[PDB]
Tab-separated table of C-alpha atoms and ligand atoms in Angstrom:
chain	number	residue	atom	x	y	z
A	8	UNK	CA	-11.558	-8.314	0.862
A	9	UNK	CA	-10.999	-12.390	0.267
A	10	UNK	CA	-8.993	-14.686	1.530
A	11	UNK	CA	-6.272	-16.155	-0.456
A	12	UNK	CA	-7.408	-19.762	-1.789
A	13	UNK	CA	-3.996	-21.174	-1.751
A	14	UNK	CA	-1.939	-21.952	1.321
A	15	UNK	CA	1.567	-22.045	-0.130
A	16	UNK	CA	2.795	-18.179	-0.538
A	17	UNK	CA	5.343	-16.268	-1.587
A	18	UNK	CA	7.022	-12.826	-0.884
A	19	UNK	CA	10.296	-10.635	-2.257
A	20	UNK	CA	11.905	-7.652	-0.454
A	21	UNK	CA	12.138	-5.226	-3.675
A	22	UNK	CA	14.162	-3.112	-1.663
A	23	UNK	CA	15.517	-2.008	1.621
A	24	UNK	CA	15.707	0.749	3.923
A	25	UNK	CA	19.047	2.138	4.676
A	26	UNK	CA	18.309	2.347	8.545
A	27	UNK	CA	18.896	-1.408	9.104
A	28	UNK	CA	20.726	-4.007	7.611
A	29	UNK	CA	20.041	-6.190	4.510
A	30	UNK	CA	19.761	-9.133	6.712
A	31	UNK	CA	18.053	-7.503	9.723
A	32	UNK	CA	15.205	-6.371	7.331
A	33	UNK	CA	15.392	-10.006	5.935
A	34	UNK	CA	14.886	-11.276	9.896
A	35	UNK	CA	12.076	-8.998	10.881
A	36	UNK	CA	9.880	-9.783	7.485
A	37	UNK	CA	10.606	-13.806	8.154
A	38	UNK	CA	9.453	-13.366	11.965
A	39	UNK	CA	6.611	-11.274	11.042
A	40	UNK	CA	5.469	-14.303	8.265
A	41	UNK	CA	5.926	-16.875	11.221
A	42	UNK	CA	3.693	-14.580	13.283
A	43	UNK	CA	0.989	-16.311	11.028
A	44	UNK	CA	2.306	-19.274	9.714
A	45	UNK	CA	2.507	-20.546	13.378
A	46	UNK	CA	-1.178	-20.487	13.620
A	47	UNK	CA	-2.272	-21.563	10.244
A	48	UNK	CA	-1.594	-23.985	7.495
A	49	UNK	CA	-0.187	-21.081	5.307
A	50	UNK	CA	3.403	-21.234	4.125
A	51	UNK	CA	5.756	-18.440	3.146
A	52	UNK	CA	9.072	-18.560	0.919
A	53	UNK	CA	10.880	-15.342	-0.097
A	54	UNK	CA	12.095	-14.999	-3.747
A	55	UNK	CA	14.809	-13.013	-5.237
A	56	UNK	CA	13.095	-12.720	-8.540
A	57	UNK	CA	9.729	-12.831	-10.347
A	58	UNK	CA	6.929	-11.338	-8.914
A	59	UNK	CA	5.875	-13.221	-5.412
A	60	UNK	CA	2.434	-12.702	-4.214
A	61	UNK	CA	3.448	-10.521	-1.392
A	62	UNK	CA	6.296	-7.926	-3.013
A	63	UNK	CA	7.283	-5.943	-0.410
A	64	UNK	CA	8.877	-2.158	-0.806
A	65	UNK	CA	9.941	1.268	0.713
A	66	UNK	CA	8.398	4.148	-0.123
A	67	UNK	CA	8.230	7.558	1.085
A	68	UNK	CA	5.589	10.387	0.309
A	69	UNK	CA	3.984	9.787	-3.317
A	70	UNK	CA	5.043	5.724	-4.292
A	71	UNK	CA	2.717	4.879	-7.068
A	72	UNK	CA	-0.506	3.767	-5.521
A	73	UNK	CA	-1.281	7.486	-4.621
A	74	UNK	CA	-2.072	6.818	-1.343
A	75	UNK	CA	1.381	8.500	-0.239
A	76	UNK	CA	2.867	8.726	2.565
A	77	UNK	CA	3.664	11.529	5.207
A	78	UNK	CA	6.339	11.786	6.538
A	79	UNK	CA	7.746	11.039	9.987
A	80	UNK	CA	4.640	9.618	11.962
A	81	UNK	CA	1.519	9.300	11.383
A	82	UNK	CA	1.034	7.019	8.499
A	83	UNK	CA	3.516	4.091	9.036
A	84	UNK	CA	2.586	1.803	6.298
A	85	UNK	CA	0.011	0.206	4.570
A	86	UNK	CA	-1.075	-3.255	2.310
A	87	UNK	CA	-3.320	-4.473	0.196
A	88	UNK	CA	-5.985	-7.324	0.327
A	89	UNK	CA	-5.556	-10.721	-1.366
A	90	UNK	CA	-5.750	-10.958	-5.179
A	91	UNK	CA	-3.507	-10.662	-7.859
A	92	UNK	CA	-0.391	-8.128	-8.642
A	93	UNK	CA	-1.095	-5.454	-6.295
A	94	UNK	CA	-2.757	-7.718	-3.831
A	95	UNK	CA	-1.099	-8.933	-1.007
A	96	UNK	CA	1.939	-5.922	-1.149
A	97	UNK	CA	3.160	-4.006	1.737
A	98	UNK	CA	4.755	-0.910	1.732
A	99	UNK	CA	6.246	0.591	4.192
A	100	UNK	CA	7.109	4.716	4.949
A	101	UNK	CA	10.822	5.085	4.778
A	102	UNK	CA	10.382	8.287	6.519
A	103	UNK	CA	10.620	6.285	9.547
A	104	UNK	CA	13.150	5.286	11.401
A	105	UNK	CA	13.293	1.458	11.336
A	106	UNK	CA	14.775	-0.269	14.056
A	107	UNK	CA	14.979	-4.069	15.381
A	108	UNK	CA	14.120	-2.567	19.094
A	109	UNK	CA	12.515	0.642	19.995
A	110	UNK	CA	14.601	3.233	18.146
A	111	UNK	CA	12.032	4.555	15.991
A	112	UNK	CA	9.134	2.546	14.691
A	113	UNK	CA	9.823	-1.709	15.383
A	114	UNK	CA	9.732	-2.969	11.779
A	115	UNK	CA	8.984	-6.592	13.057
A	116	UNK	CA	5.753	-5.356	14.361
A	117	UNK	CA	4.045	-3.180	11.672
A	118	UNK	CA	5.324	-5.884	9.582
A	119	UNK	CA	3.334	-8.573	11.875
A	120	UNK	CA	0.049	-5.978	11.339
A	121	UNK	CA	0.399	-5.138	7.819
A	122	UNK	CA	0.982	-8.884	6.542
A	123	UNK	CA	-2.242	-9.622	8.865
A	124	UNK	CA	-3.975	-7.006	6.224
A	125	UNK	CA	-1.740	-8.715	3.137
A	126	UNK	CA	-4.295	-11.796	4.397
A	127	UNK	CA	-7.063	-10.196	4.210
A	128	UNK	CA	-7.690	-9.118	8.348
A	129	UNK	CA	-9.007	-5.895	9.010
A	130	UNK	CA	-8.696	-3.659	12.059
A	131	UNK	CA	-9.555	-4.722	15.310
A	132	UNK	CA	-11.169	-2.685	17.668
A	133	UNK	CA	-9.651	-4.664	20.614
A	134	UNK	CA	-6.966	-2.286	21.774
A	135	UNK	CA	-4.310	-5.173	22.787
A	136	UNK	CA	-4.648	-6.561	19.169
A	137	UNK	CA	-2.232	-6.813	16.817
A	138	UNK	CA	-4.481	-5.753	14.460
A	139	UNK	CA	-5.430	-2.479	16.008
A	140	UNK	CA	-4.782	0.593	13.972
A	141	UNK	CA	-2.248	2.219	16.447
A	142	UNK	CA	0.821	1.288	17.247
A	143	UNK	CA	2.532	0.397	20.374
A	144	UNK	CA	5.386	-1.221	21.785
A	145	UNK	CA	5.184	-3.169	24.997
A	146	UNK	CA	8.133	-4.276	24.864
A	147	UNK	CA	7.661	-7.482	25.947
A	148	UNK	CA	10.263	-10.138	25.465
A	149	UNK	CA	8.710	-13.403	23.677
A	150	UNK	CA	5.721	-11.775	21.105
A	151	UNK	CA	2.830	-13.765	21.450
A	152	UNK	CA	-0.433	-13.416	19.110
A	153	UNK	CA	-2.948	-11.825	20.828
A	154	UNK	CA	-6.163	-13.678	21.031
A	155	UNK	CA	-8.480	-12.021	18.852
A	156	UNK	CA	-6.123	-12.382	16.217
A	157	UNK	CA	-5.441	-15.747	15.934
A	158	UNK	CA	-9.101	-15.860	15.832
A	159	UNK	CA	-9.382	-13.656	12.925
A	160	UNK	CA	-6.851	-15.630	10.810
A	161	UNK	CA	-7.751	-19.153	12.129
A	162	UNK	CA	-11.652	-17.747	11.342
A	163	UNK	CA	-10.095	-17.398	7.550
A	164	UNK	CA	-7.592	-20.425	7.225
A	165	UNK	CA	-8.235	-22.654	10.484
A	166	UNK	CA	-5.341	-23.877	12.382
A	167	UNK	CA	-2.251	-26.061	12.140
B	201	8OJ	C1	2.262	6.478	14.876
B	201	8OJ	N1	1.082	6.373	14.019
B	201	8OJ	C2	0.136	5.440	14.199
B	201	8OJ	O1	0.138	4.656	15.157
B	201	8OJ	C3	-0.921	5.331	13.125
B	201	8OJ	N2	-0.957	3.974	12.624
B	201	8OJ	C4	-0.450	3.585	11.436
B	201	8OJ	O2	-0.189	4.320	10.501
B	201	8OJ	C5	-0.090	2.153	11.318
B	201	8OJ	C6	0.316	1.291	10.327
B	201	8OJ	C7	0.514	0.066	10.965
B	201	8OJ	C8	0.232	0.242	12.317
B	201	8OJ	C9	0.301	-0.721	13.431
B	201	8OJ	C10	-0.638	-0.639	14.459
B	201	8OJ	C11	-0.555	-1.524	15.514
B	201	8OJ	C12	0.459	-2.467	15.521
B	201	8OJ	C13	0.579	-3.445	16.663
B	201	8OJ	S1	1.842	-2.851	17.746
B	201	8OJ	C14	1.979	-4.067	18.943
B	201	8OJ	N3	1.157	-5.150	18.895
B	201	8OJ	C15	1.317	-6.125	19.816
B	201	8OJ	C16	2.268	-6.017	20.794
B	201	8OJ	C17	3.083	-4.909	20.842
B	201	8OJ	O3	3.974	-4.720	21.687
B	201	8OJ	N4	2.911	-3.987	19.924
B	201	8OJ	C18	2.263	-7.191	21.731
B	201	8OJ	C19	1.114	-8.070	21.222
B	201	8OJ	C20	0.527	-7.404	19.957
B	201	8OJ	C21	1.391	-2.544	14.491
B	201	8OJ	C22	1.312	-1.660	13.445
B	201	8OJ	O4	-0.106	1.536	12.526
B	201	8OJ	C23	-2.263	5.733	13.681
B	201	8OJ	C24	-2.217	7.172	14.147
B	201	8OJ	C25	-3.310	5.555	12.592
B	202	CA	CA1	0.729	-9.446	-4.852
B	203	CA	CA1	4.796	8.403	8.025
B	204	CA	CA1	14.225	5.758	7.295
B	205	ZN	ZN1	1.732	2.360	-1.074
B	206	ZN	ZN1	-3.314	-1.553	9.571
């Protein structure tokens, strides 16, 4: 995986899942950006046509990429490394229920992971990182980056 030589990027919601709003799904993916662009010098603006760098969709079992999903649990979503077209997306298992608390899966948060991957971080084996490969919710009430990875995406971009 690279890193994305431009700072200035772009996403699109292609479509939306039917367990929260149009708007709350618009809230979550902007938080989940600022996640990131509150660390970095990277910018993101959504776009309501054309092809952004980050297009973001719902999917459910076989989507096109034929890495399908599964169902309710176990594979929540996934994304794609920087680089053209199908770099950068995220797709996320509408066999979940998505909620903007703990309801069912928090979309804010395995948004916040999987953009970390649209940006070319991997896993972490640090257990309290966002970038860990299972999820949890703390349920804290202000989110705040863990540690190792702003120092994953600073390592890539530096700071602001
Ligand atoms: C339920 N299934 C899974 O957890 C599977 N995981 C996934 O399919 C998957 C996709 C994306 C994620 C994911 C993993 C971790 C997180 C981070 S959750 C979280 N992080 C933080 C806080 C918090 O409350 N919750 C506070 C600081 C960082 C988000 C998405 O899991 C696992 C069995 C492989
Ligand atoms: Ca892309
Ligand atoms: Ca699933
Ligand atoms: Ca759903
Ligand atoms: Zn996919
Ligand atoms: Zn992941």
């Amino acid at each position: 995986t690279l890193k994305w030589s431009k700072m200035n990027l772009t996403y699109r919601i292609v479509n939306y899942t039917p367990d929260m709003t149009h708007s709350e799904v618009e809230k979550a993916f902007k938080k989940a950006f600022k996640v990131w662009s509150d660390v970095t010098p990277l910018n993101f603006t959504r776009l309501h046509d054309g092809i952004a760098d980050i297009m973001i969709s719902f999917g459910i079992k076989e989507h096109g990429d034929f890495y399908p999903f599964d169902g309710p649990s176990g594979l929540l979503a996934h994304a794609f490394p920087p680089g053209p077209n199908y770099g950068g997306d995220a797709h996320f298992d509408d066999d979940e229920t998505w909620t903007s608390s703990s309801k069912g899966y928090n979309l804010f948060l395995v948004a916040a992971h999987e953009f970390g991957h649209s940006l070319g971080l991997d896993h972490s084996k640090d257990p309290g990182a966002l970038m860990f490969p299972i999820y949890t919710y703390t349920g804290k009430s202000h989110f705040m980056l863990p540690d190792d990875d702003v120092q994953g995406i600073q390592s890539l971009y530096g700071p602001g």
